[PDB]
Write a protein that binds this DNA or RNA. Structure first.
Ligand SMILES: [Mg+2]
Ligand SMILES: [Mg+2]
Ligand SMILES: [Mg+2]
Ligand SMILES: [Mg+2]
Ligand SMILES: [Mg+2]
Ligand SMILES: [Mg+2]
Ligand SMILES: [Mg+2]
Ligand SMILES: [Mg+2]
Ligand SMILES: [Mg+2]
Ligand SMILES: [Mg+2]
Ligand SMILES: [Mg+2]
Ligand SMILES: [Mg+2]
Ligand SMILES: [Mg+2]
Ligand SMILES: [Mg+2]
Ligand SMILES: [Mg+2]
Ligand SMILES: [Mg+2]
Ligand SMILES: [Mg+2]
Ligand SMILES: [Mg+2]
Ligand SMILES: [Mg+2]
Ligand SMILES: [Mg+2]
Ligand SMILES: [Mg+2]
Ligand SMILES: [Mg+2]
Ligand SMILES: [Mg+2]
Ligand SMILES: [Mg+2]
Ligand SMILES: [Mg+2]
Ligand SMILES: [Mg+2]
Ligand SMILES: [Mg+2]
Ligand SMILES: [Mg+2]
Ligand SMILES: [Mg+2]
Ligand SMILES: [Mg+2]
Ligand SMILES: [Mg+2]
Ligand SMILES: [Mg+2]
Ligand SMILES: [Mg+2]
Ligand SMILES: [Mg+2]
Ligand SMILES: [Mg+2]
Ligand SMILES: [Mg+2]
Ligand SMILES: [Mg+2]
Ligand SMILES: [Mg+2]
Ligand SMILES: [Mg+2]
Ligand SMILES: [Mg+2]
Ligand SMILES: [Mg+2]
Ligand SMILES: [Mg+2]
Ligand SMILES: [Mg+2]
Ligand SMILES: [Mg+2]
Ligand SMILES: [Mg+2]
Ligand SMILES: [Zn+2]
Lengths: 104, 75, 159
RNA sequence: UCAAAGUUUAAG
RNA sequence: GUCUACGGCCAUACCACCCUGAACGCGCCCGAUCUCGUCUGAUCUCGGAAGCUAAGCAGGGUCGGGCCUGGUUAGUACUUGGAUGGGAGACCGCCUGGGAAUACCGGGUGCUGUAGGCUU
RNA sequence: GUGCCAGGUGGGGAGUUUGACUGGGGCGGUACACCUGUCAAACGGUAACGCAGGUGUCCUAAGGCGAGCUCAGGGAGGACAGAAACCUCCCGUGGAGCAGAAGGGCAAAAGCUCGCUUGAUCUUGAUUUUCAGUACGAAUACAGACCGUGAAAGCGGGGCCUCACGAUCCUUCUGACCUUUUGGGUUUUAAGCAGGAGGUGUCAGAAAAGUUACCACAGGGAUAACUGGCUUGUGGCGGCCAAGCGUUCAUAGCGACGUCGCUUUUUGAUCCUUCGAUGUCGGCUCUUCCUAUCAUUGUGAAGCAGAAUUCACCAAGCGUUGGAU
RNA sequence: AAGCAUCGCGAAGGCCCGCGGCGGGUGUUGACGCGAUGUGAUUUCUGCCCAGUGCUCUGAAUGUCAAAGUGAAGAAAUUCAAUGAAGCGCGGGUAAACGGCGGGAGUAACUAUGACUCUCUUAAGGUAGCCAAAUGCCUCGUCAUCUAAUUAGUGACGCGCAU
RNA sequence: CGAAAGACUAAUCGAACCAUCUAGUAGCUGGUUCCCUCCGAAGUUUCCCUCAGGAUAGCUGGCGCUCUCGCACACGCAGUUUUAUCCGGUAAAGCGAAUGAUUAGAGGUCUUGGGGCCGAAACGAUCUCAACCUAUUCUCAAACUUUAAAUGGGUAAGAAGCCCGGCUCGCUGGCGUGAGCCGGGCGUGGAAUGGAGUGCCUAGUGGGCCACUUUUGGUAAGCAGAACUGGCGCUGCGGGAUGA
RNA sequence: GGCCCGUCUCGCCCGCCGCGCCGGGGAGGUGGAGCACGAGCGCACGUGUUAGGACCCGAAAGAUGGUGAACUAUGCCUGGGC
RNA sequence: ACCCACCCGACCCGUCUUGAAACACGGACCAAGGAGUCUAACACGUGCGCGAGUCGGGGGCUCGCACGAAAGCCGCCGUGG
RNA sequence: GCCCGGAUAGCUCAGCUGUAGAGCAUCAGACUUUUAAUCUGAGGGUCCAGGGUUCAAGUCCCUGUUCGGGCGCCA
RNA sequence: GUCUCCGUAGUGUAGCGGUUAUCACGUUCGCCUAACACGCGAAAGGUCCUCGGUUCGAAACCGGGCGGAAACACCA
């Protein structure tokens, strides 16, 4: 799929509609000092082998893409997660497809 | 060791032992799931019924007097 | 095992009758449903927003809500052992007034006419209905001509 | 101061 | 008698060809300065009123098609309930109640609401 | 070299696992989560490894408005131009198209072509569908915001409708001059609260390979491998019909195309009986029964001159052998 | 089992025991030895394949690679950086290491086979031999022989399911 | 320990014996103790590494409560029917109606052809077979249908109903709607039957099978699989010799 | 209908030793195992559901600590036999 | 109620099972033993006491306990639940 | 997920911010009687894609898509 | 029966949805040779197995046809 890099949609902080900058989302690095990780590390420590489970049975072949809507008006710049349906092709601003033209 | 897969065989009889009772219709059912803007308004209408009570009482008294005059004329 | 799909087995139910496709004639949309109006649901293929589920097709019920272009309507649905009065929001186009009730209203109106009158008279009149009784004693005049004899006819093989 | 180059009617 | 505008039900209103249309209307019609829009004033938009019912439209016509409604088909097909009925089975008959559909043959061929004309 | 950390290597050793459905299991399939039509007995609901198919996607527009058009196909015309290029007239109830399976739905549209757009945005509850009437997903009607579009009425919070999806825990991102981070205060950090995303397809969601003929235990006739039951497709045996063969002549003897049967000496189906066990092939030995008769007795037939013979009837009294592998 | 053939080891060693020890077995031993495998007297041979899985050899020329140590910013927890062992990768050897070892077409003046030729393909494409064997499905293979008669036996054949 | 058979290790070996942890765990076998009395099931639901088990609904029992009036003076409810009124796309029917299938001749240079025969060749003559068409004709459909039953599923058949008078609204609006409140006025509103309502605790069950009719797979089956009701299972008794 | 606590939306006013990124209210939705003139506590008996040996009997296993080479396996020492 | 006769009826119990007289298993015979317990926790029902309370423990005071390891009492009466 | 290679003309590869290198292959000229072999020249690069830094990027930067060797693995 | 794959000038094969369908051999035609072979230079030749679909477009992607060839067919 294709989505455009600008998006005039709702901005919670301002209250109105407004232009947002769009960009697809990504996972951050995994802390190391989150409560979870800390809990795992001092469980996983010592003997016993592995303690929690390890997922080894992948089913789906695509992620729900998520747009990160950042508001353009300054004195705000409020980011926002905006999910979209699954797709094994994604892009932003990859031309406008063009109705009624020659294919070659 | 294949099983019987499904049936409805004895079920009708089971249902009818204890009736199949129709759903108990009360007078004055709830206003749950009514178009909000209605409910707002009717709530407000109820809220201010007490305003314009004295007028209504006076009107009822005038009606009762007119009824008493009518029954006296009949008798 | 069967599919649980919403519109499964509505090939014939939601399908406009022969030579009645096309535009939904406007009377449909412009007749008023109050609260407490008895109403018989009947899905319609053309209008697909606000369709009722196949179970309530044919079922009649009373109106309890009236939104802009739909009407909440309490209907009884049976479920194995138990009947559940439940409330569905159907868009007008899948809904008519049930004439069921109107014959009763006519009869009440006739009783009120026949109760106001025949009070000053004194003669009390039959208000209740009564089932079609046995058809009374009566004469049959075979005026001149005698009855017609009917022999059963002799068999023959046609095909 | 050494590349490759095989064969030839039975019909006198 | 009938029309125009907006309609309801949506063929008894559809289609084909034929005839007839007073008055008012509806139209075709004649123009492109402006408005508007086209490759094109054909359509669309606008300004008109010299012609004409040719066409649309209306009314009628056709041993017309179609549609609508009766008969017939037929108490036939099918069918609720019943029997220690028949029949080797396939199936069939009876009782008890309910009861269709073609072909075939008739009739019909828009009704009507609100507002405004004309026939003064 | 010893002591203690770190990475590697380590069936030498340890522990454990090695799905489910299933006309026994295994192999094969997925009927394991969904959807169309049918099955389905004219409300709804309904089964099988029933039938025919589809799904894990696709779309910045193929979503949202508004405008304008009309499609498949055919006919008749027009330079090159032909069955097919482009133009024009006429007919055209949709026979086209609407991402995909199928069904419904759709014509001054839901199709096509333009114009502007982000209602695929932010937020409470109610309801429907599966239903236990719990979730998820998917949907319906509202209500409050902020927008789009249209002259406007209106329409629009994704795809014309029916499928395209995922809990706790953990992680990640976003949100508020938010709460806590503990004797108090400032700042990092961490923990909360609310919404997305990272996936469990065995799809209400363990983290998991074999083998055992060296085998074991609890059970099972809910389940196979015999017999015996039902069944008789298949095997065997037997009719009817008679187109042909039989030099000639349908029927002495046969008999196609068709058709009706019987049998349980075949093999399948099936799974009723038996898994706190009915000793599992053959041969030898011995008795008895059947006849669907090879021989023998008595007979009918011939394409029976005799001889040899096939065909049929009564008929199971008596026989039906010795060896090579 | 002898015979054959591989492999490790020159002792702070190979192989191995042990919970531990300046422990122990081989070892009162030293390569004509100790240890670990295969094959299985003699005779006669022992073909090709290092692509795969093993084993092994080399190593700043070098991808990654941990803890510590080194620098970095930070108020500090810290984060970031460079640095970089074995092992993987990279590159040689090895089959008496585990093992592996082909398929089409056309072709000879009767036909038939096919010496011969053409391709397509692998890491080679089964060499010497041997055979319906204790190994061959088809199978009671074919021919011979052995018997009056042989799914048996022997000898040949070889196309060899799958030597 | 094994010149290797998983051999041997005190009648024991693919891991000896003895005691303990130990009454190890078992969705699986087996058993489970007196009498009468009353009520009396289920083998179906969704979920489950679920299919010899649980969960959850269902079906059962127990305990009750709230009312009702045979105390000449009843309301409500139903595995009925009636009277109204909706719904339906199965049987049947149909295919000179769509979709798909399909026979035959009549008619048609429609198209055009491919093969002919008579033609140099010619929609010329004559046949022919292709597809198409004009009326007709034969036979069909679980996944076709214009039609369209029987049985069947909703509603409705009054006091929570009618009919007047007036107030409230931030909804809706030329005025009005629509709803909500007060205040009065009016009674049996089809047949037949029966006392209703309501709340807690709750066991067993979750292998089913059989017959009428309908019905899917299968040549069929004392086969496998659904529907409807009734049975058996839980149940004796008369009859069917015998027998769920 | 109303009240309380969470939560949202919208809005206009109050308060004072500390006028503040202070505190307090209002109207309308919506979440709560809430209030709306109390019904509990203790004891006893019954039924049900669990945790325990857990109705009774039943494994194949698993672990800890000990006894055995008088049989048999193999080595060594010392005797005997053919 | 002991025995015997006759007519009619009448298969062996227990058990799992859709289905047992079964060619399904357990059972020669008799005696004695022999399996839903106790503790804790919850829930609902019921009985009693008190009631916006209720409560009893734990402790303490009263005896050598014959009966008592009870019974009684406690600004502990309520720390506390 | 982390580190790092490579992506340049038909192919294989050089390239230090200021006509893109080498060799082969391609096509015209010699040589050949001709062909091949070989010598001479010519033609041919979206420098994988997009954005930035820069006066200027094939290179620096970041971001993607690949593409491989190693690391790594909590819904 | 299952699952799998492959059907391309005369032969054996390449082929990444837009090709003049690639290479080798074979074939024909020149030359070279006395002739032949080799050699050199030219040419010709595909129903892409069959039908239907998706696609703007299919030799390939998808469905069914007619062929062909491996593996499985186990416990009794
Ligand atoms: Mg560690
Ligand atoms: Mg079952
Ligand atoms: Mg004009
Ligand atoms: Mg006219
Ligand atoms: Mg005229
Ligand atoms: Mg007519
Ligand atoms: Mg192991
Ligand atoms: Mg299984
Ligand atoms: Mg039905
Ligand atoms: Mg439009
Ligand atoms: Mg809104
Ligand atoms: Mg659309
Ligand atoms: Mg401090
Ligand atoms: Mg073995
Ligand atoms: Mg075996
Ligand atoms: Mg056993
Ligand atoms: Mg059985
Ligand atoms: Mg048998
Ligand atoms: Mg003859
Ligand atoms: Mg026996
Ligand atoms: Mg006989
Ligand atoms: Mg060796
Ligand atoms: Mg060798
Ligand atoms: Mg190697
Ligand atoms: Mg050989
Ligand atoms: Mg012999
Ligand atoms: Mg031999
Ligand atoms: Mg062994
Ligand atoms: Mg026990
Ligand atoms: Mg179980
Ligand atoms: Mg059992
Ligand atoms: Mg149907
Ligand atoms: Mg029919
Ligand atoms: Mg069965
Ligand atoms: Mg039972
Ligand atoms: Mg309980
Ligand atoms: Mg217990
Ligand atoms: Mg035990
Ligand atoms: Mg264990
Ligand atoms: Mg018994
Ligand atoms: Mg028996
Ligand atoms: Mg048993
Ligand atoms: Mg016994
Ligand atoms: Mg006893
Ligand atoms: Mg109590
Ligand atoms: Zn903003």
């Amino acid at each position: 799929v294709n989505v455009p890099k600008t998006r005039r949609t709702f901005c919670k902080k301002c209250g109105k509609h407004q232009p947002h900058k769009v960009t697809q989302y990504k996972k951050g690095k995994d802390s190391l000092y989150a409560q979870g990780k800390r809990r795992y590390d001092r469980k996983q420590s010592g003997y016993g082998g592995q303690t929690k489970p390890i997922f080894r049975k992948k089913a789906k072949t695509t992620k729900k893409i998520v747009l990160r809507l950042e508001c353009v008006e300054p004195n705000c710049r409020s980011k926002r997660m905006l999910a979209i349906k699954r797709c094994k092709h994604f892009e932003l601003g990859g031309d406008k497809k063009r109705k009624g033209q020659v294919i070659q | 060791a294949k099983s019987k897969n499904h049936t409805t065989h004895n079920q009708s009889r089971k249902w009818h032992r204890n009736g199949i009772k129709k759903p108990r219709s009360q007078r004055y059912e709830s206003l749950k799931g009514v178009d909000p803007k209605f409910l707002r308004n009717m709530r407000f209408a109820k809220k201010h019924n007490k305003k314009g009570l004295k007028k209504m009482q006076a009107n009822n008294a005038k009606a009762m007097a007119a009824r008493a005059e009518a029954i006296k004329a009949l008798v | 095992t069967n599919t649980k799909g919403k519109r499964r087995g509505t090939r014939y139910m939601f399908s406009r009758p022969f030579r009645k496709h096309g535009v939904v004639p406007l009377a449909t949309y412009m007749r008023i449903y109050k609260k407490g109006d008895i109403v018989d649901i009947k899905g319609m293929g053309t209008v697909q927003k606000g369709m009722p589920h196949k179970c309530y097709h044919g079922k009649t019920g009373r109106v309890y809500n009236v939104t802009q272009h739909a009407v909440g309507i309490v209907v009884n649905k049976q479920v194995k052992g138990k009947i559940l009065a439940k409330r569905i929001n159907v868009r007008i186009e899948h809904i008519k007034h049930s004439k069921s009730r109107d014959s009763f209203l006519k009869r009440v109106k006739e009783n009120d006419q026949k109760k106001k009158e025949a009070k000053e008279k004194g003669t009390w009149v039959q208000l209740k209905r009564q089932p079609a009784p046995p058809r009374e004693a009566h004469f049959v005049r075979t005026n001149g001509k005698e009855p017609e004899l009917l022999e059963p006819i002799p068999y023959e093989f046609m095909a």
